Structure formats: structure tokens, C-alpha cells
């Protein structure tokens, strides 16, 4: 299968740096053209960059001439994207996809047919913190449980139960900005309640802060 | 820049009915005969865009035959024969013909379906969380549609507000239903002060009130 896995999004300070590295699998890197697409919270697609096969030919969104770099290393058959002087504006899910074949004289388009899982830039002033995971517990035949995700920045934090294992019926909710700057967000899942006395974790994962938390919900 | 405008912004649907999203160019997207540099996105909730549709009028691998793509120049149209539940989300238009690559503003697709009741949940705050010194009771609305649904919190059925906060996920894939998350937040002292607290859900015609007692 044609893949794509990104990483190195994180929070930085306005005037910052972060490289984001985008590794290509199933396919022959160096024969396409890669692009990369953010999306600000809340908002649209917004094209940043694209990069031709052999990385002879560059192209840049205006709004990032002079502060971002698009390379590749096709041995290694990983994208790049550096950010230089990091603005607030800066702030989204940077997507990397595979363009153009590339191998013919003039490249031929398919659309950008393989999309990489996203990662998060937030730039900000502020501070991270580490998330307080709390379980959420009754005080029926199907019960709901679930996970606080409390006091955190910033933005995402994921969740999944039983590592993965349990899906069906888990709702993970939009996270809340509290009053204080801070957010807090809400998993959820509906089980038996027959084989309650089964063990249910959620697994809470804030890479801004580096912190992964696993909470056993009794 | 080529500027990209889709019409309509939101489109409800019922399932088993077609659909058509518009987009139109700032200037043609036609390099050649046969080659409109236009794709079609679509873009789940929690996920990556994928394509649909790419060059005006080509099936990408693995899209259902419902969707196709269709146009030339500046007008272009993509319809989906028959709507069905798993094709919920945020669809884009792209045009790929110049750098920048511009992208309509994003057309959100809902599902019309039956009225169906939340299944109503109330927690309690966690002994580790009051420690801290402050507790969060929680409310969840399963699984329910419409999104229009009203939560009001009763502590000793006195009525609150400002001291919760709310989200509602996105249209799910399978049963097309939303489902909420409410917070109410109080210090550990306004908490142990009072004993029953309640979740009013208002839908219609029907309330449906869950609680607890602190003490038990």
C-alpha cells in the first residue's frame, strides 16, 4: 500500500523553528512530486509548498517566501518541510501528499492521490502543559465510560481505549478552551455493564508535552 | 491567484438522493483538450482530505461509482447519484493548473434522518480530580438527532448557567447521529455544599433528566 507518515509538528514561540519530516512507503519516492497543505483550525485547505521529483524545482505560497524550506532526501525517501521564523499564522495540521509522476519529460498529474495523517504546528507564547486525566464512572444493561482530559495546551491531544483494541462506540469529543486559557476535552464509550467486575483503559496522547497517560477506568 | 467558490456551503440530504456541489474559477482550468486541472476532495471528520476525483472528470482509485465529476473551463459540478451515510464531511475543490494551488472554501455535507432520542449518561467527579480542588460533572447526550438538543444543569434543582461548557461531534459515518459532551465546573467547596446534581436534556417534547446524589 502507497503511504504516507508524517512527523515533527509541535508548539514553538513566534520566530521559532521546527522541521517537518514526511516518509514515504509502497512506492518509488524520488519518481513523484510532493506537496505539502495546512489547514488552520476551524478553516480550509490552504496550499504551502510542492517539490519536484528530483527536488530541482521548488514552489512557495507567498505568506512563507523566505521563512519555509521544502526539501527531500529520496534515499531516504522522506519529504521536509522546514519553518523558519514562525508566525502565529503558521498555526495548523500540515498534511504532506504525493503529485505528479514524474519520470516522463513533461510530469503527469493524478490528482494528489495519497494524503500523509497530519501533523500539528502551534505557535503561540504560551507555555505547554501536560494533560490531568481523570475516568469518568457512574455513581442499566449498557453502562458509558469514559475519560477527562483536563487542563491542557495545546491542541491535540488523541485517545484511544484499550490500545485501539475497542472502537466501536467510543466518542471523542471536541475539545472545550476554558476560561483559562487551558483545554479540556471528553472521551467516551458504552460497554456491558454485566462484565464491568472486563478493564477498560483510555490512552491519552499529548506530544507537545511528550506525555502519554493510560487511565484504567473502575 | 486563481480563487476558487463553491456553491452550496452546507447541503442536507436525505439518503438515497443525489447530490451536486458547484465550483467555479476566477480563470479557466482547461490547459489542453481533456485536461480541466480541477480535483475533488473530500475530507471525513478527525481525518486527511482524500481524492475523489481528479483532472475534471476521473475516479480515483477506490471511489464508490456514485461520484462523478463533470465540466470544463470555469464551471465545474461533482454529484453523488445517491447519498449514503459514510459519505458525511467537507468536500473541496482544487484546482492543480498553477502554483498557488487554490482550494474552494469547502462544502459541508449532511445527513437528513430520522428523529432519534440520546441515550443520557451523568458522571460524577473523579476523588482524584477533587484533590485538586475543583469538579467537573459531566453529561453525555449519545447518539441522538437533530443536532438541536438543550442541556440544562440543576444543582439542588437550582438552574445554572455559565459554568458549563459544551461540544457535539460531527455526523457519525454509520447512523448518521451526533452525540455531546457537557461540563459543568465548580470549586470542591461549591461541590460538597450541595447534594443532587442533574442533567436536563430537552428535545421536543420530551426531557429526560438524569442524576446523583454526592453522598451516595
Known amino acids: 500500500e502507497v503511504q504516507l507518515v508524517e512527523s515533527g509538528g509541535g508548539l514553538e514561540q513566534p520566530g521559532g523553528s521546527l522541521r517537518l519530516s514526511c516518509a514515504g512507503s509502497g512506492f518509488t519516492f524520488r519518481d513523484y512530486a510532493m506537496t505539502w497543505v495546512r489547514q488552520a483550525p476551524g478553516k480550509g485547505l490552504e496550499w504551502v509548498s510542492s517539490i519536484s521529483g528530483s527536488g530541482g524545482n521548488t514552489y512557495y505560497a507567498d505568506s512563507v517566501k523566505g521563512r519555509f524550506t521544502i526539501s527531500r532526501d529520496n534515499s531516504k525517501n522522506t519529504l521536509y518541510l522546514q519553518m523558519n521564523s514562525l508566525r502565529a499564522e503558521d498555526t495548523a495540521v500540515y498534511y504532506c501528499?504525493?503529485?505528479?509522476?514524474?519520470?516522463?519529460?513533461?510530469?503527469?498529474?493524478?490528482?494528489?492521490?495519497?494524503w500523509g495523517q497530519g501533523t500539528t504546528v502551534t505557535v503561540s507564547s504560551a507555555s505547554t502543559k501536560g494533560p490531568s486525566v481523570f475516568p469518568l464512572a457512574p455513581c442499566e444493561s449498557t453502562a458509558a465510560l469514559g475519560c477527562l482530559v483536563k487542563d491542557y495546551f495545546p491542541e491535540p491531544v488523541t485517545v484511544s481505549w484499550n490500545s485501539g483494541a475497542l472502537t466501536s462506540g467510543v466518542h471523542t469529543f471536541p475539545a472545550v478552551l476554558q476560561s483559562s486559557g487551558l483545554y479540556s476535552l471528553s472521551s467516551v464509550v458504552t460497554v456491558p455493564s454485566s462484565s464491568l467486575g472486563k478493564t477498560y483503559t483510555c490512552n491519552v496522547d499529548h506530544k507537545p508535552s511528550n506525555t502519554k497517560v493510560d487511565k484504567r477506568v473502575e | 491567484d486563481i480563487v476558487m467558490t463553491q456553491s452550496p456551503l452546507s447541503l442536507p440530504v436525505t439518503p438515497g438522493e443525489p447530490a451536486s456541489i458547484s465550483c467555479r474559477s476566477s480563470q479557466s482550468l482547461l490547459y489542453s483538450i481533456g485536461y480541466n486541472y480541477l480535483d475533488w476532495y473530500l475530507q471525513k471528520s478527525g481525518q486527511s482530505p482524500q481524492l475523489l476525483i481528479y483532472?475534471?472528470?476521473n475516479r480515483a482509485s477506490g471511489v464508490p461509482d456514485r461520484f462523478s465529476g463533470s465540466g470544463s473551463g470555469t464551471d465545474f459540478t461533482l454529484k453523488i447519484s445517491r447519498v449514503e451515510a459514510e459519505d458525511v464531511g467537507f468536500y473541496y475543490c482544487?484546482?492543480?493548473?498553477?502554483?498557488?494551488?487554490?482550494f474552494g472554501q469547502g462544502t459541508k455535507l449532511e445527513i437528513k434522518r430520522t428523529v432519534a432520542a440520546p441515550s443520557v449518561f451523568i458522571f460524577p467527579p473523579s476523588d482524584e480530580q477533587l484533590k485538586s480542588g475543583t469538579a467537573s460533572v459531566v453529561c453525555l447526550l449519545n447518539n441522538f438527532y437533530p443536532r438541536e438538543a438543550k442541556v440544562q444543569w440543576k444543582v439542588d434543582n437550582a438552574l445554572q448557567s455559565g459554568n458549563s461548557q459544551e461540544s457535539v461531534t460531527e455526523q457519525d459515518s454509520k447512523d448518521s447521529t451526533y452525540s455531546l459532551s457537557s461540563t459543568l465546573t465548580l470549586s470542591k467547596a461549591d461541590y460538597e455544599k450541595h447534594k443532587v446534581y442533574a442533567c436536563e436534556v430537552t428535545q421536543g417534547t420530551t426531557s429526560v433528566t438524569k442524576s446523583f446524589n454526592r453522598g451516595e
Open positions: 483532472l475534471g472528470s
Open positions: 482544487m484546482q492543480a493548473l498553477q502554483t498557488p494551488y487554490t
Open positions: 501528499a504525493k503529485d505528479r509522476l514524474s519520470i516522463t519529460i513533461r510530469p503527469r498529474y493524478y490528482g494528489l492521490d495519497v
